[PDB]
Amino acid sequence: YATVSKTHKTVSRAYGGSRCANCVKERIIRAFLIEEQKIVKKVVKEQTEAAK
Amino acid sequence: ALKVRTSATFRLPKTLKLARAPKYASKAVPHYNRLDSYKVIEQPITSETAMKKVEDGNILVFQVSMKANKYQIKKAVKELYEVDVLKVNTLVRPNGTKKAYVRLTADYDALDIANRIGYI
Amino acid sequence: GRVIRNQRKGAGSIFTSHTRLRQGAAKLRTLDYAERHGYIRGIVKQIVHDSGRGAPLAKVVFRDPYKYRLREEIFIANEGVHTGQFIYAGKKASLNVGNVLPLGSVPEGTIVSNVEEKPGDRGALARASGNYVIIIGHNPDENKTRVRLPSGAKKVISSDARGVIGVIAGGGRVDKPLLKAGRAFHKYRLKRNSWPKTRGVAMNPVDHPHGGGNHQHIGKASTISRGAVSGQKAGLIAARRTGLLRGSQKTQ
Amino acid sequence: NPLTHSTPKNFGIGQAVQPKRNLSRYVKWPEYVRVQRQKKILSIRLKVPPTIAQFQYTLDRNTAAETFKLFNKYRPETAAEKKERLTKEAAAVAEGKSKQDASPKPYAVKYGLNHVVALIENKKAKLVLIANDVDPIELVVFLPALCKKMGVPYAIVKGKARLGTLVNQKTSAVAALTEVRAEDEAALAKLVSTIDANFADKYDEVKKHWGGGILGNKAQAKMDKRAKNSD
Amino acid sequence: GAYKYLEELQRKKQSDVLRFLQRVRVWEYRQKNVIHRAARPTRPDKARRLGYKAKQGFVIYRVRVRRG
RNA sequence: UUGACAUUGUGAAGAGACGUUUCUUUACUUAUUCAAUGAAGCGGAGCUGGAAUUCAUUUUCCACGUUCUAGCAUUCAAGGUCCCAUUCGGGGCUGAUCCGGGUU
RNA sequence: GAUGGGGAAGCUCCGUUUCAAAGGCCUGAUUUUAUGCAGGCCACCAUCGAAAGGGAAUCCGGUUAAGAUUCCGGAACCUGG
């Protein structure tokens, strides 16, 4: 692999070698969904803070 | 008073480390070049089958120091004989000497330079 | 006579453990501020067979609190735990299967595995396929919890000692007859040079106390004082009794 | 500004790699560092007996400053000095009069254990400074006791290094003057008065008490708390 | 001389001062290496008496042996 | 294996030997012993907050960053505040309370 | 199987990250200089032990009394620069 052009050992996506398309597709989603639900996980416990 | 170590590891402090500025010299006189040119190359080899290499392969054949090497041999050949060199092969003969096949570049004819040196 | 077989073992040699294929060794996390005060969440990345040890291991990985990197420990896997599972460790971790809690933080009744003998030793008790220890009660006269060990014995250790909720995995491996010598062969091949076993009674006197002959037989009680000297301890060692029982429970 | 952002970080258990902090409290120091630290401590825990406990009674910053300012007036001869005299002294006297009394009587500090002990024994010492930190202590433990028998005023002073500088050396152990210029018996006695009170009258009482005990933070606290919450 | 009092103090190995001294010192020597260089003689009156002098080329080593 | 003596030190209860002193359970920690860790978060006290007493006070208790998810977590930390005339670079103090240097 | 060490009268025995102050990698400063230094991370870490284990890269033709994936001819590839 040291005698080979870079195009031979990657693809054009987040995580070229490394991971496998369906695994970055899962990967992004899981990121977005959780970071969203964070905000909520956060705002929701700030509501029930005032309620006290 | 204190000081901040952000590592819980204590290291050996990096410290001066002078340099030897002797006082009396190791040797009295530095050895002359062991293994110079007259010592690299010791003898032609002139068996009939080496001779054929001269006549037909543009190769000079030499017994050569056991301690030599393809660099050191090429250099000596290049200077004792004022010729250019294509590659050197070597082997250690079974009598314990080292023989060197030195092929000359095509600007030279080994047979010519063979009998300049003065064998045939 | 001659140095007997059971004495030759101390010298290692031909008798050391066969360990090439073993995974790493199996341990809790080293006990840190994370675990001493809160919890720390790892995932179980893979679960894996370890040569010589029925009972599978869990390779579970945690973030490093003081450096940017990942840290993989090798737990013993606990039945029900499963790749992708989160594993919570420490004082505040909640009572689920697979987590590791200080004994002092679980209620009486709780059953745990791979439990420490002294806090921080990283796991000593109930580790083999199928085993576990039961917490029987607590005593904050110095931080102690009293437990039941798989052997029957009760033992009181520090409520700071940690266990992992659940039982060790690997079922009732012993419930299946071995069937043929070859299975024992392969069995001991990943463990150590302890198999087959020649009876002393089939050896000559030089070789063993059982030894002499003309008919095979022990010729003296096979029941040895604990204070007997090595060379002499073959048989039933400080046997407080001997013979068939049908026993049925232990120490309670 | 509206472009930069305030992204606080969470540093609790379970997130954010903990930030560099100060761990001097926790370093695995080199073994000689520990030994000199534990030695001090081992020596603190454990009843220290009266005669070793005499020390640690230093001499206050001001009385010491006073006593050095006087002692500093009596430097021994320097190298250059004695050379110069030895040529003046010898070249003339050894071909002229007064038995090398071709130089005035000197007044110097008097130092060196053997020397200074005998001065004390011979009731020839006017005041004596014993360092608090001679090791081995046996070199110096008999001194206050000796001085007590002999009448000799004495102060355990701080700095073996400092009595050094007082005689043009690295360290000096003792130092004690005997003679003294008459423009000076005044200060001398004023020192000896305050000193003697502190360090000499108190002898018979000091010699009756032990040192040591002391628990070190943690233990001292859990006996602090043990007896405080539970009383 | 300081020495005549060293010489005599040292003879009271069961006195309060010396038990203290002995207890603290033996701890120290145990934490150092079985053989190690000593900076100064622990015992000046003694070194001396056995022929040591305080001068370049005289050396003191401290050593531990197993006992029994 | 069992006893004595040595290593061996400091406080008490008692029963005991005629205020010291030797005897059966015991407090101490520095000797000795055992375990771990790249000696990281020990010990004491406090900011904050909620209840309490007390017939008002300091008189204490209690709380004080992570649990739907097989993500992500590093560049003395962004922020704030100071300094250098500050061109770009740095630095200090907070962020991250204090105080013992007993690694636990 | 050396080493800080611990045993042993001693030949030496034990131990190998071990109760040890156990390094060296980048490059700025400085351009008095290619160089001392100013940054800084990372290090429980000798070495020996495989011609059947792991592993960078070569082929066909021709040639000698006896050598050849090694010479010749031709055609390649790897590694460091």
Short mmCIF file of C-alpha atoms (C1' of nucleotides) in Angstrom, two decimals, chain C residues 33 36-39 43-45 63 66 68-69 71 83-84 86 88 92-94, chain F residues 34-38 40-42 64-74 104:
data_model
loop_
_atom_site.label_atom_id
_atom_site.label_comp_id
_atom_site.label_asym_id
_atom_site.label_seq_id
_atom_site.Cartn_x
_atom_site.Cartn_y
_atom_site.Cartn_z
CA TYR C 33 -12.05 8.65 41.42
CA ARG C 36 -14.89 5.69 44.10
CA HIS C 37 -17.42 8.53 43.79
CA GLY C 38 -19.70 8.18 40.75
CA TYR C 39 -20.02 5.90 37.74
CA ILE C 43 -19.48 -0.52 26.12
CA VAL C 44 -18.84 -4.20 25.66
CA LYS C 45 -17.12 -4.35 22.28
CA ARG C 63 -12.88 6.38 27.94
CA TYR C 66 -7.23 11.97 32.27
CA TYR C 68 -7.81 11.58 25.31
CA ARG C 69 -7.86 7.86 24.40
CA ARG C 71 -9.12 1.94 27.46
CA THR C 83 -22.05 -6.54 22.78
CA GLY C 84 -23.35 -2.95 22.50
CA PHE C 86 -23.41 -0.13 28.25
CA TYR C 88 -21.75 1.38 34.39
CA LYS C 92 -23.46 5.41 42.06
CA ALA C 93 -23.98 2.86 39.28
CA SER C 94 -27.45 1.42 39.18
"C1'" C F 34 0.51 -7.09 53.35
"C1'" A F 35 -1.82 -4.91 48.86
"C1'" A F 36 -2.19 -1.15 44.72
"C1'" U F 37 -1.05 3.27 41.56
"C1'" G F 38 2.09 6.80 35.51
"C1'" A F 40 -5.11 11.95 41.33
"C1'" G F 41 -8.10 13.59 43.73
"C1'" C F 42 -6.64 11.62 50.90
"C1'" C F 64 -23.95 20.29 46.25
"C1'" G F 65 -22.00 18.02 37.39
"C1'" U F 66 -22.65 11.64 34.18
"C1'" U F 67 -28.09 5.94 33.39
"C1'" C F 68 -33.88 5.24 27.13
"C1'" U F 69 -29.58 4.66 22.26
"C1'" A F 70 -22.96 -0.35 20.31
"C1'" G F 71 -22.32 8.23 18.74
"C1'" C F 72 -18.73 12.56 20.13
"C1'" A F 73 -15.28 13.96 24.62
"C1'" U F 74 -7.27 15.66 23.55
"C1'" U F 104 -3.57 5.48 48.96
#
